[PDB]
Amino acid sequence: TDEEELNDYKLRKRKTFEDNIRKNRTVISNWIKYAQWEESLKEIQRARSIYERALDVDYRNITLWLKYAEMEMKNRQVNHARNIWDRAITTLPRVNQFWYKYTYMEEMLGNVAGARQVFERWMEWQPEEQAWHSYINFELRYKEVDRARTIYERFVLVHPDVKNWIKYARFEEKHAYFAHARKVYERAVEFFGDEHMDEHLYVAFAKFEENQKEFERVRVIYKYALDRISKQDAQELFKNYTIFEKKFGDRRG
């Protein structure tokens, strides 16, 4: 009577947990522990329906959706996985973890253009900096020059952060970008910080221009001083500007 005791144990556990979800239709630990108990059997066609009727009472929680998505990701079925990932990310756009784990599953998968469609939808919802510079690191880790330049023009118009103003000038330290580096430095000089400089952009500008030759390095730090903030600099960096100008030139007598 091994089959009798096996079905008796399974039927008692199923009946107890169905009475538990019948009593409380609010807390979501019961459905996920019941469904991972069926996931322990490793061969199921009914636990997907359990997760499907468990999200009808609560679709606003992250835990049930991410657990069913990681369960379907743990198995070898990828089509139903995409069929639940896309409705999860179109149901809850403002959360980040669903898009992160789906793009990480695609990191385990190939680099097809459907991934790029997912990433442009992920750009379309306007997330924070943590998503966007992660996507430009994604574009760096496959060595894309033209397309990473293409997706980066819409980056600056949303966040005018100085951490992003200094990193819009990154093709200088990647490709050296000369004529368009001068155009990007024009873009760095005409925008916001019209009379106060935001005290950080011209530091990196003079740093790359000292990494370059003596083209236009005298003008920006001392001769473009119309945009000062009450002393043009604090005490901590003015003599550093002076020695930054001194010992890195042609050194004429």
């Binding site: 089509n79 139903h80 995409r82 069929n83 896309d86 179109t90 469609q117 939808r121």
Partner: peptide, 16 residues
Amino acid sequence: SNALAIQVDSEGKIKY
């Protein structure tokens, strides 16, 4: 089939 049909318009972007 197993997967659903992909709906893309004539000119614009992929519709979801």
